[PDB]
Design a protein around this ligand. Structure first.
Ligand SMILES: C=C(C)CCOP(=O)(O)OP(=O)(O)O
Ligand SMILES: C=C(C)CCOP(=O)(O)OP(=O)(O)O
Ligand SMILES: [Mg+2]
Ligand SMILES: [Mg+2]
Ligand SMILES: [Mg+2]
Ligand SMILES: [Mg+2]
Ligand SMILES: [Mg+2]
Ligand SMILES: [Mg+2]
Lengths: 362, 362
């Protein structure tokens, strides 16, 4: 698909720019430059490119209905690509750190970045951080004179904070709230009392929906100079909804999509995560079922893991999901309908983003 | 100096803002609020506050020799405190991740954040990131309508990026450049050929000088709208020079100052770090002394460690530091003079900053 290639080509632009700058402003040597090139390829490439491509699509849809000089068209499409990449680079930062936090082995069909035979966990922390840093450099280099620079950077920042906070909810979701104390050694939860829809929604809202759906969407508008022509509240509601569904697919896939189709190896069960499956199960399980689940959740032992999976299967969880899916469908279409009022094209962009998301098998 | 008291009470103001915001916008629960309040205090207070206080002292310099209404005088003093905190919070981000990376045990007389009884490394990483991300929230909230905002953010990003690049130089400073390949497992240098002054200088230039000296000084000029009235070039050089010297003291203390007084347990020898002692030692040792060093360096075994220290002691590195120090004093005063040309008062700020650093013992 053309356009996918156009987007990857701007990646080539961004990379050369970044690496040339290391040579000329940062006294980098050829081997570290190479290391940073490979780290950049591994961590930023290989995914679905939903997030960046969404920004490209939102911008295409305003362009098609809107008067610009050809040069303004080119600048907006180029900005679109560059903003998209800022978002793909922000994902890469998230995934690098998160794979460390989650104890994972595989990303995007390759070993996690920290598990690259010649990487080590300790540079990985720092490479992850370099990834975020690159985003700000791109912003400042490419958008230096653009009128959306402030709005873009300030949103970028809030979305990024929201994500960090969500990752905290995420990373401590098997703790008892009443017990969370940096002074005192942290035993995992035994009642699972905090495995509720509400607690679950809060993790997901923050750890995922902002950077995966809100950010791409508004970015497309920012570079398009088109924020005025939509109802921000509507954009916020739809991004939170689709974003939640997205994280739910991901919880489901952690357990039931095999590594070979998925490109990653599940760890939620091993990690005692407050996942949509755990939450949904604990919401419907009987006394016998709750008890076996309590005896097996949160342990690396493949036989225990396997007992949780049998229980998920027995609990007919695939079908609660399809129910959830259908309710989301209803609500998404409803929000798309409401977005047709001000921006029919944004609306259409959202439909496309929804469609892709809806039928990812990732 | 009444100055320290303004600075500290501003923290209280910043902490409350960040914490209350967490409650009203991020749906946080009181336990997590309490976890972040302690994280915030633990990783941000208890330092020597040279960075933050530099930006206060620089701004105070101009208040002294300009004249302003007390309103404006207090808007600048307040801005300088917030600026100063952004810097301290940025150190905090660096120290938390740097402690995990170095596998250290103690920070400012207490366990490293990631080692606190109920903190997991996995969550510590994310705390470290929340800290960076706090600095951006501050900037946008306190400095929204300030005209230095774009300059300030831009600079901040450059300094942070350079700091990440340098941590990369540092944490791969015990590798053979020629053999730094993500795919291939990588043993540590055996020739130590990269243990040079030029390479040392470059590590330290990026990992430390920019955020320790360049940023607090320029930040001061920023909040005082005084950048125009100094020779930026001089600032850059005096910053790079005090900065190198500053890090040399760190390296020396890492080996020679006791935890009791130091506040951290040394680990440069154990981690095979390209410290100023290893490089100064390789620059003067005879063949038998180089060989003993190579046989012993980069290893936790306390005995191997004691050999290196024995070796360092025998070579009067203590001596060499004084030579270096005395040279640094020449160069510094030189640069201070050159700064009295446009900016007598800023030049005094620097001299103050120098004397603090010069005779610290941390
Ligand atoms: C579920 C989330 C939020 C992280 C996984 O992101 P993706 O599945 O979209 O990762 P890519 O491989 O497409 O980058
Ligand atoms: C030398 C560097 C760059 C890190 C240690 O910094 P400090 O020793 O200045 O730490 P504070 O306690 O003053 O924060
Ligand atoms: Mg993960
Ligand atoms: Mg995770
Ligand atoms: Mg997942
Ligand atoms: Mg360290
Ligand atoms: Mg270090
Ligand atoms: Mg040290």
């Amino acid at each position: 698909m053309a356009s996918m290639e156009r987007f990857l080509s701007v990646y080539d632009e961004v990379q050369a720019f970044l690496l040339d700058q290391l040579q000329s402003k940062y006294e980098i040597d050829p081997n570290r430059a190479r290391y940073l090139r490979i780290m950049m390829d591994t961590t930023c490439l290989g995914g679905k490119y939903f997030r960046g491509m969404t920004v490209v699509n939102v911008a295409e849809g305003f362009l098609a209905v809107t008067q610009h000089d050809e040069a303004t068209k080119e600048r907006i499409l180029h900005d679109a690509c560059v903003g998209g990449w800022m978002i793909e680079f922000l994902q890469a930062h998230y995934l690098v750190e998160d794979d460390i936090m989650d104890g994972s082995v595989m990303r995007r069909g390759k070993p996690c970045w920290y598990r690259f035979p010649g990487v080590t966990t300790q540079c990985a922390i720092n490479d992850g951080i370099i990834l975020k840093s690159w985003t700000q450099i791109m912003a400042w280099h490419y958008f230096a004179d653009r009128p959306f620079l402030k709005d873009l950077l300030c949103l970028f920042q809030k979305v990024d904070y929201a994500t960090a906070v969500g990752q905290m909810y995420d990373v401590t979701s098997m703790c008892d709230s009443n017990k969370l104390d940096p002074e005192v050694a942290q035993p995992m939860t035994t009642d699972f009392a905090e495995f509720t829809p509400a607690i679950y929604k809060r993790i997901v809202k923050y750890k995922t929906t902002f950077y995966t759906y809100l950010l791409p969407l508004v970015m497309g508008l920012f570079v398009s100079e088109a924020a005025a022509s939509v109802e921000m509240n509507l954009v916020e509601r739809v991004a939170h909804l689709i974003g939640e569904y997205f994280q739910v697919q991901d919880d489901v896939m952690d357990c039931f999509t095999p590594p070979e189709q998925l490109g990653k190896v599940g760890t939620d069960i091993e990690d005692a995560k407050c996942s949509w499956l755990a939450v949904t199960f604990l919401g419907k399980a009987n006394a016998a079922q709750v008890a076996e689940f309590k005896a097996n959740y949160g342990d690396k032992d493949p036989a225990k893991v396997a007992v949780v999976k049998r229980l998920y299967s027995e609990a007919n969880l695939q079908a609660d999901f399809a129910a959830y899916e259908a309710e989301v469908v209803r609500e998404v279409e409803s929000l798309i309908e409401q977005l047709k009022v001000k921006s029919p094209t944004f609306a259409e962009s959202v439909a496309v983003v929804w469609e892709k998301t809806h039928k990812r098998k990732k």
